[PDB]
Amino acid sequence: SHMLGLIKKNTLLGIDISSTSVKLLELSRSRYKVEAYAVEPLPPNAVVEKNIVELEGVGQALSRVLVKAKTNLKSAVVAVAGSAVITKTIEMEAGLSEDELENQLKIEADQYIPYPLEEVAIDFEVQGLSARNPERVDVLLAACRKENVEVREAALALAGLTAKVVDVEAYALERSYALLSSQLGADTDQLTVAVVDIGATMTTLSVLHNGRTIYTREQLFGGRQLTEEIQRRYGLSVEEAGLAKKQGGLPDDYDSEVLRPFKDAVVQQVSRSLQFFFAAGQFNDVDYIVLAGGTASIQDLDRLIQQKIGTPTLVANPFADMALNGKVNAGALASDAPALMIACGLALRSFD
Amino acid sequence: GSHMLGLIKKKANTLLGIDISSTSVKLLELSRSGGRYKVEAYAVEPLPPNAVVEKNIVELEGVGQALSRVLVKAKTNLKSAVVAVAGSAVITKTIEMEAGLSEDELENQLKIEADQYIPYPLEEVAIDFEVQGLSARNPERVDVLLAACRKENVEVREAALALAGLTAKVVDVEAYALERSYALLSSQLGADTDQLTVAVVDIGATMTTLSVLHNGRTIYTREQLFGGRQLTEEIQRRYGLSVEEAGLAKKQGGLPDDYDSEVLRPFKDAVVQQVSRSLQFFFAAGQFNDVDYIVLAGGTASIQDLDRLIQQKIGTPTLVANPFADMALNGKVNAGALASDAPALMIACGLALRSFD
Ligand SMILES: Nc1ncnc2c1ncn2[C@@H]1O[C@H](COP(=O)(O)OP(=O)(O)NP(=O)(O)O)[C@@H](O)[C@H]1O
Ligand SMILES: Nc1ncnc2c1ncn2[C@@H]1O[C@H](COP(=O)(O)OP(=O)(O)NP(=O)(O)O)[C@@H](O)[C@H]1O
Ligand SMILES: [Mg+2]
Ligand SMILES: [Mg+2]
């Protein structure tokens, strides 16, 4: 049987399918090491909200991120939104094997989960015997619609990839966030930290106390508001405008007429997100603010946010202590670091 | 399977590192938070004599209780553990098999055809394998790495763990565990473990093991019936002490003055002579003509200023193994006792380090 470990000699790809891009990350373990990484832009309306709509379009883009990454791995960990997952702890009969529970859960899930039985993808974990009654066990349940799973399974299939693990995004963030312990000066158990993930069309506040998420809020603020003022003012395309953010080269009036106002729009948004959280719970302050997402790469945006809020702020970098494959561009990776938090957390799932 | 789902927050649970040897049983529990490790629990429970002869468990009930007793001394709630068999118990061989066969299909055939590729009889073999890839000689066949041992070596350790309420999730090999713990010595060695070529000398009670480690991998292994019991036996005889008495005075001291010149010094030289021959055996065997470092392991490596002697007499930089140098410690863990037992826990640590690789 599989008690044997006579041979010392598995890693999975971290694939984050977003609305504007597909991100791939490969990790190894000894100390961690980045074997490969790539980001491939998506066609518009290919992924609306957190749902894949144009099936074949995502597949092609998924196929293109593989060649750009240039890897031989073919299994991957993908993530669904936490909004699609229902988590609850129920009581079931004791003395049942995991196979028996799984079967009964295929039969009787509709009673515990709001989704219609046909459409339920359920996951469970026996916590242990109920303290009250030795006849019953406490069973943790996490379920989502099979639609969320199958569409990602099919989308990965178009690139010859297989979904080894269907993870949840909030959990993957926690895993990669734990790698930030070095940069904060204490292990994350000590701290309550507000992670601000500033994407292209969405900004997310995630408060993590001792490593576990207590708060999540989302707003329609993002980096696309920055691009579209670049497109508009300078007559550049979506592709051209995006590079000008990284590469620069925009005329002198860029800072004062476009970038500085957007920074203020970021600061005001981060400020508003934090105020929503304070008035919604027991917490009166946060220890740190961690900027994540592509828009977090804006020069000295961390310093400005630190000023206007008064809370310690840093740009997320899960690859700070990691080693790098020679074929991985160290400069490119550093600039895309705060956008790879989710992709990093999915890749960290491989070692469990 | 149908569960391709990772919707529930995995525990990512660790395992106990249990090193069952001929004279003692050692336990170690590890965790990690940042880049720094932490010793959650550890205890050592001595074994009855003739309970484990050579690398074989002989008294099943006797081993289990000492195993069960260590748990309590360590005071841990973990019930799953990693145990290790000796590399001398493992046959390693690379064979060619039909291509296009699944992992499941190959294992089924390997259970029947085990006898053909392995020295052991069909009924008494525990076989492990890994597909490497297409064979170079013939692209129609695949290379499969085999590692196998006698089923008895595994089963008695599983049953012995069961009697203490423990489960052997992983049956490891002692040499691999040594490699994992040896990596932690990067700080003390003044160089990365990936670069250096190091001869690790594990001086036990009844067994001495030489392991040459180049870039992290084992290339050489030689064993001798030389050990620290030779020192303990001389203490028993000359001063009328018991095995327990002799062992305690070995560490704590307080014996009469003639002990150094007539007992301790001759044994020290006997240690140096032993290490000398092993390295000479190794240089006159393989391609290597010299090594960068010598790492002393086993409780006998705790002998005061023994490290300098071996270092001076051989002419190679030498260090006493301590895998808990950079590690953090649980409050319930004796920081002083661990230090004195540090070099003896190389194998037990590597068994616990199995979870973090
Ligand atoms: N160096 C940079 N400076 C400023 N902005 C950048 C930089 N690099 C990337 N961006 C912006 O970062 C955004 C992409 O962030 P990313 O986190 O990948 O979004 P997303 O989470 O994939 N999409 P969504 O969450 O659906 O809105 C793009 O709009 C870019 O404009
Ligand atoms: N302070 C000390 N100084 C010198 N020797 C010591 C000291 N403390 C313990 N020892 C001895 O170091 C020896 C090493 O023990 P250890 O290597 O754990 O035994 P073992 O390897 O389990 N048995 P074997 O399989 O025969 O090697 C023990 O026999 C102790 O007698
Ligand atoms: Mg995002
Ligand atoms: Mg030993």
From Swiss-Prot, chain B:
The keyword Oxidoreductase does not apply. Pfam families: PilM_2. The keyword Nucleotide-binding applies. CDD domains: ASKHA_NBD_PilM. InterPro entries: ATPase_NBD, FtsA/MreB, PilM, SHS2_FtsA. Its main location: cytoplasm. Mg(2+) binds at residues 115, 118. SUPFAM superfamilies: Actin-like ATPase domain. ATP binds at residues 21-26, 205-206, 250, 299. Signal peptide: none annotated. One of its GO terms (biological process) is type IV pilus assembly. Keywords: ATP-binding, Cytoplasm, Magnesium, Metal-binding, Nucleotide-binding. Disruption phenotype: Deletion mutants lack surface pili. GO terms for molecular function: ATP binding; metal ion binding. GO terms for cellular component: cytoplasm; type IV pilus. It is found in: Cytoplasm. Inner membrane component of the type IV (T4S) secretion system that plays a role in surface and host cell adhesion, colonization, biofilm maturation, virulence, and twitching, a form of surface-associated motility. PilN/PilO heterodimers form the foundation of the inner-membrane PilM/PilN/PilO/PilP complex which plays an essential role in the assembly of a functional T4 pilus. In turn, associates with PilN and facilitates PilM functionally relevant structural changes that differentially impacts PilM binding to PilB, PilT, and PilC. Interacts with PilN; this interaction modulates PilM ATP binding site. Interacts with PilP. Interacts with PilO. Interacts with PilB, PilC and PilT. This is Type IV pilus inner membrane component PilM. It comes from Pseudomonas aeruginosa (strain ATCC 15692 / DSM 22644 / CIP 104116 / JCM 14847 / LMG 12228 / 1C / PRS 101 / PAO1).
